[PDB]
Design a protein around this ligand. Structure first.
Ligand SMILES: Cc1ncc(COP(=O)(O)O)c(C=O)c1O
Ligand SMILES: Cc1ncc(COP(=O)(O)O)c(C=O)c1O
Ligand SMILES: [N+]
Ligand SMILES: [N+]
Lengths: 381, 381
């Protein structure tokens, strides 16, 4: 516990660390059911080693690692239908969302300096399903949120947004492509039309869904759900995280803006962090190149196959999924959800907690794990 | 540049990445003279591999990695004379400073809710030598800074601070233990007395110096410079970064608060980031344990030996250091500093840019590199 005068040997400290690591869960062990992280693609371990001693906070010293960040951003942009995107491979979806909020706020500041806004703080429409990073941004940056309600399918009420934009002077709209709790997809196409018609910035949070939705086989797509979310809709920015469904090591988050014109509104380097990893960009570029669309499609639809297997097994055992799954996320309605979560923990099953248990069917979740999960859950009931 | 349907082999993508890495500089090659990062302790590469698939954003899944973060914080706290510190191993000094600012701001908010502050925004005294992360915080969080001037020795003017605290209602004071440009140490002892006597929060930015100052041999300490900066002075928080002079891989920053009572003012998890590495805490704990005070002392004073060698060689060659060095940082006065920096770049010497060139004598800078540097600089002149 205290700092010591004398050092210890490598063998002593590594065996201590391994003892602590043995207290952790591991993704591959059939314990973790409620996380949007998973095992990294094995090749990334080598890449992390190669790029460990780089720093994208000083890109003039690491020109190649900086180029690889630009290439990673370009590949994500291509996936999102935008060959001119301006962006960064940042620390995660939180920093990405915070940077989009900073941009929204600085567009507002410029208006305020010209007398073109009656808002004393940026006014941003945010669905109540938004990830907590949006609350961190509100709290830090003194934003005013207009919380948008959700419809029966748990997607943002587009008519509310349109009415609010008519009633109020609005500085930004947030839409979510893959909500944290349920994996639902807001109607970005309609939100983007509202935004374009009213000259309002729109940010899409695709932290999770951005690397799932473009790869979904048709049999997993649902009638009447719109899967369009990217720059083909003319949106201003998109968060999309390789360390979620991109199989990249933390920290690998992504923020893309429609073009380089947005960079000036990130002025105070454009990232929140200063000193920052170079291996995230290298891993993001390398994994997307190594897999190609074919390899990512295979992984995404394997997860969707296991998601629909879990959904089927749940109904067969008389459990009530909140919704038919859209992405590789299923939630189980339960009034005793807190106690059931604890009882599951006691038996080696870690879900997250909507009066529901959330299951994220990442690539580490296999059929045998779902079978084991159902068996344990029945026993609890 | 575009996303492709077909993937590529591991050999193809690794050889592409290695070609980009070959465009980077490497710390050990005698090129990088102006960075506060350096080579990591080799043992950390193994630790990164062991802890790569952990996430301190979900510490209930990684109990051992979470304990190692707590142990890392405790070892830093012990080094800083505080066995009860509450803190986190975060992404860097920027996030650490931003968290201290959030705490300052939320203490102010509570006062505002009670009518105990006439300030419409937190008012914080910040020396003009402060790192740019403080500007990021100001810009995001709408802080009001009272910029404190520096004295002839480039440390904060304590009389200005005292006068300002008498004149104004002040919500926070920043002092720097190891300035970014010159490595100077503010008079934290006096600033802490002012702060305590007036019930003002004081944050110490020891991002760089926190892992240098406690290890300085007496022959490097200068008469009349006060080296006291830590919790023995009763300060409220300290930033201290293992990925600077702790030889830990990015991301390994540190933020410590005086006790657990500060955690409530970080409420909106207490970090800015969500999903976040677990290997920083493991590396921080392991490196401090592996080295002990003896091993870190050896490294710090080796750097100081090379710093004073560089200082001596500069004067012998008629160059004008800005100051006699305090930490392992020397700056060279030069009116043509921009052009000289570019000419140095062209010859393989990368310094940073006070009309001066900044040299940070990290552990990768050896005597032969300083000799080579002086030779090249003379030739330019
Ligand atoms: C929709 C969404 N956005 C953003 C985030 C934040 O991502 P991170 O934890 O990488 O900061 C989350 C994390 O899962 C999320 O679900
Ligand atoms: C004094 C000081 N504080 C904070 C920082 C920010 O640290 P980071 O780049 O790790 O965010 C710097 C970086 O060197 C610094 O010099
Ligand atoms: N998680
Ligand atoms: N640097």
């Amino acid at each position: 516990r205290n700092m010591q005068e004398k050092g210890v040997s490598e063998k002593e400290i590594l065996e201590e660390l391994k003892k602590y690591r043995s207290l952790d869960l591991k993704y591959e062990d059939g314990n973790i059911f409620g996380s949007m992280c998973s095992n990294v693609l094995p090749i990334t371990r080598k890449i992390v080693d190669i790029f460990l001693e780089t720093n994208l906070g000083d890109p003039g010293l690491f020109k190649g690692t900086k180029l690889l960040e630009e290439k990673a951003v370009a590949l994500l942009g291509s996936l999102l239908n935008n060959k001119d995107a301006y962006g960064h491979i940042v620390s995660g979806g939180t920093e990405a969302n915070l940077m989009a909020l900073r941009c929204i706020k600085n567009i507002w500041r410029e208006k305020r300096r010209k007398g073109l806004s009656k808002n004393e703080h940026p006014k941003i429409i945010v669905p109540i399903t938004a990830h907590f990073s949006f609350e961190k941004g509100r709290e830090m940056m003194d934003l005013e949120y207009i919380y948008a309600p959700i419809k029966e399918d748990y997607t943002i009420d587009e008519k509310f947004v349109k009415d609010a934009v008519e009633d109020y002077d609005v500085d930004g709209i947030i839409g979510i492509a893959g909500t944290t709790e349920l994996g639902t997809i807001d109607n970005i196409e309609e939100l983007s039309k509202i935004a374009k018609e009213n000259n309002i910035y729109i940010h899409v949070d695709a932290a999770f869904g951005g690397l799932v939705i473009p790869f979904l086989d048709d049999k997993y797509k649902k009638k009447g759900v719109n899967y369009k979310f990217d720059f083909s809709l003319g949106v201003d920015s998109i968060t999309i995280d390789p360390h979620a469904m991109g199989h990249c090591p933390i920290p690998s988050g992504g923020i893309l803006f429609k073009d380089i014109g947005y960079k000036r509104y990130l002025d105070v380097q454009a990232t929140i962090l200063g000193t920052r990893v170079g291996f995230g960009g290298a891993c993001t570029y390398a994994v997307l190149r190594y897999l190609g669309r074919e390899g990512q499609r295979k992984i995404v639809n394997e997860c969707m196959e296991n998601t629909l297997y879990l959904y089927k097994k749940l109904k067969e055992n008389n459990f009530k999924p909140v919704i038919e799954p859209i992405l590789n996320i299923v939630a189980i309605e339960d009034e005793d959800y807190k106690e059931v979560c604890k009882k599951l923990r006691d038996r080696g099953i870690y879900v997250s907690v909507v009066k529901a248990l959330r299951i994220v069917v990442m690539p580490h979740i296999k059929r045998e794990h779902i079978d084991n999960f159902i068996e344990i859950l029945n026993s609890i009931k």
